[PDB]
Amino acid sequence: MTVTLERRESTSLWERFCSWITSTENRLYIGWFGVLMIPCLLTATTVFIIAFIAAPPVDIDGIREPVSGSLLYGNNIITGAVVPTSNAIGLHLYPIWEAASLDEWLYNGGPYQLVVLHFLLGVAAYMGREWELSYRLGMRPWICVAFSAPVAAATAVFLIYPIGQGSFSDGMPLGISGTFNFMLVFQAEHNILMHPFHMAGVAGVFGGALFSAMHGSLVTSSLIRETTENESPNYGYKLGQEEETYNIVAAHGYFGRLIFQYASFNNSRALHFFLGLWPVVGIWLTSIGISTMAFNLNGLNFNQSIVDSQGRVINTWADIINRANLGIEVMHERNAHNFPLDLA
Amino acid sequence: GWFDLLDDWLKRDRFVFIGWSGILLFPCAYLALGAWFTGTTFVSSWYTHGLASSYLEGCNFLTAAVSSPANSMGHSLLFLWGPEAQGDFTRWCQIGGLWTFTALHGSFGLIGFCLRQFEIARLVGLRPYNAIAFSGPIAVFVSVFLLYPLGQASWFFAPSFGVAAIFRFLLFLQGFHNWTLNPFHMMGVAGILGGALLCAIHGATVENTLFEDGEASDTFRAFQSEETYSMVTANRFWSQIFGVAFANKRWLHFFLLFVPVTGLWVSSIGIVGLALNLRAYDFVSQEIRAAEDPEFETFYTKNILLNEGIRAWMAAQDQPHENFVFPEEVLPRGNAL
Amino acid sequence: RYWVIHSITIPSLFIAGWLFVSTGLAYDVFGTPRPNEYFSENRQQVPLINDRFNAREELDD
C-alpha cells in the first residue's frame, strides 16, 4: 500500500475498450483526452473549411452591415476569413438550435462561436493528450507545459478578450487580414507595444529564433566527419545510434571564444532546458498581457509626459505612436459609435 | 616575421579573443554602443523631429532614442568634418550626426563580428555555419537601416535607435506601406514564430526524453559520447501525437538553423521593395469591386481605412518639416469618434 | 585589497557625472535645450533645420 495501485481487471469488455483507447500501438495515439479532442477538432475543422469557402457575409458589429469573408463571395486566401459573431449577441451562447434557421445563424456569425469553442476544447484536450502519451511511454511529462504557452495565446485571443470586452465580436477573426485588423485595433485601444509583457513576448520570439539559429549553427558546425564529399552529411547519422554525431567540446569552445569562456554552456541538459524555457515564458507573459489588457489594464501611457518651464508639452516618440493610435481609433468601425467615448 | 608575430599576438588565447577581425570589430562595436548611450542620455531631437529624446530632457528607457537626422540633410553621411557640421560637435549632434555615426559604425561592427565568427571557426577548425546564420541579422540591418532610407527621401525616415521610436517606424510602415499585407513579411513572421516554436519544442522534447543517468531528482547534474536523451522515444512520441517526427539529429539541427534565417532574408526582400515604395498595398480586384459596390466589405478594406487614419493624423506630427496643415474638417474619421 | 583605489575613483566618477549634469555643462556640450529654452520670446514654433549646408547659421538664429 503505497502510491499507485498496481492492479488489473481481467479481460472485461470495458477493460478491452480502455485498453484500445490507451493503446500505444495505434499509429495515432487516441487517449481519453483524444476521446474529447477528435470529435471537437473534427466538427471545428469541417465547419471552418465549409464556412471559409462558402459562408455568406456576417453582421459582425451588429450594425446591420454584413462583412464578406468566404472565397465564393469575392475573397482570396489573404483577405478571406471566418467573421466573428454579431455584437448584438455579445457573449450569449448562440448554437444552431437557438436560431430560427441556418440562414439567420450564418448572418449573425454562429460559425465563429462554434469553431472557437470547439477548437479551444480540442486544443486543451490536445495538451492533455501530449501529457498522456508522455505518461504511457514512460517519459518526463513537461512537453504539455511548453505547449501550454500557445494554448494560452489562443485562449487569450479567442475567449478571454471577448469576455473582458463583452462580445465575441472582439475575438480575433479566423483569417489573415482579420488578424491584422485585430492587431491594429488592439494597438489603438490598449497600446500593446508599450506594454512590458508584449515586449517580453517579442523577447521570447526574437530570442527564440536567435537561440534556434545559434544552437543549430553550432551543432551543424561541429558535425563529425562520417560522410563522403558532396554527399549529404545527414547520411552520417543513423536513427537510434548511441554515439554522439557532433563534437560538443568543439562547439562549447567556439562559443567560448566568440564571447567569453564563462558565457558558454557545458551541460547540454541545461542548454536545452534554456532553449525550452525562454520562448515558453515569453509567450506565457504575452498571453497574460492579452488577457489582462482584455480587462483594460493597458500599456504604459507617456502622452504629454514632458513639459517645459512655461508649461507647454514637448512631444516624444510616445506622442507620435499616440498619433498613429489615434488614427486607428478614429477610423475603425466608422459607423459603430454614437457617443464620444469608446468604453466597450 | 613581422606579420607572423602580429598574427601570433592577435590570435593568443585570452579571456576575450581579438584577432584581425578584432581590429575591425572592437572599435566600431564600442563606438556604436557608446554613441547609443551618449545620445539616449544627453542629446535631444528638438531641431530634427521637434521631440525630446534623452534622459536629460525627461525621457525614460522606453521613450528615449538616438533619432534620425533632419530630413533636410538628405542622404548625407554627416561626417563630423562634413560641410554641414563643419567640425562643430554641438551642431553635429543637433543635426543628427550621431545617427549616421551609430549606423555606419554599427554596420562595420556587424562586418567585424561576422569576420570574427569566420576567423574563430577557421582557427578552431569548425564549419562556418554560425557566420552564415548570422548573415541573416545582417540582411535585416542593411535592408532596414540603410537600404530603406536610401530609397526614400532621406535618413529621416530610417528607424530611430529607440524603443518607442522603433514602434513609430512600425506603425509608420503599416499605415503607409500596408507592411502586414506583404507576403515577404508574412514569410518573415513564419520564420520567427517557426524559430521560436522549434526552439521551445526541441528544448522540451530533449528535456522530457532524458535518460536516468543519476539518482537525484536534479537531472542536470547527471551529465560523453552516449546520447543524454532517447531519440527513438522522442520519434515515437511525436509520430503518434503529431503524425510526423524527426529521425535525423543532423537534419533537425540544420532545420532549426534554416527556418529563422530564411525568415529574416525574405522579410529583407520585402523591405527593399518598400525602399522604392514598391508595396504590396492593395488588391485591385477588391478595390474596384468596392468602388462599384458600396455593400461589399472585407477585413482588407477595413485595414485600408485604418491605414488612411494612421496616415493623416500622424502625418501632421511625424513629418514636421513638411509643414502639413490638415484642418479638422478634412481629417478622415467615423461617426462620434 | 583592491577596494581602495576603487573607493577613491568610483565615487569620484559618480560625482563627476553628477556635476556634469548639475553644473549644466551637458546642455552646453550636446546642445540639449533646458526646460526653459524650447521656445524663446521670438519663436513660438519648432526650430527645425531647413538648410543642409547652412545648418550652422540657421542654428545660430
Partner: peptide, 28 residues
C-alpha cells in the same frame, strides 16, 4: 586587454549612472 575592456565598459557606466541620478532631481 582585460583591463582595457573591463574599464572600457565600467568607467563610462559609472559616469553615466551619476549623470542620470542627477537628472532625477532636475525640476521644471
Amino acid at each position: 586587454f582585460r583591463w582595457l575592456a573591463i574599464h572600457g565598459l565600467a568607467i563610462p557606466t559609472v559616469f553615466f549612472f551619476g549623470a542620470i541620478t542627477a537628472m532625477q532631481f532636475i525640476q521644471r
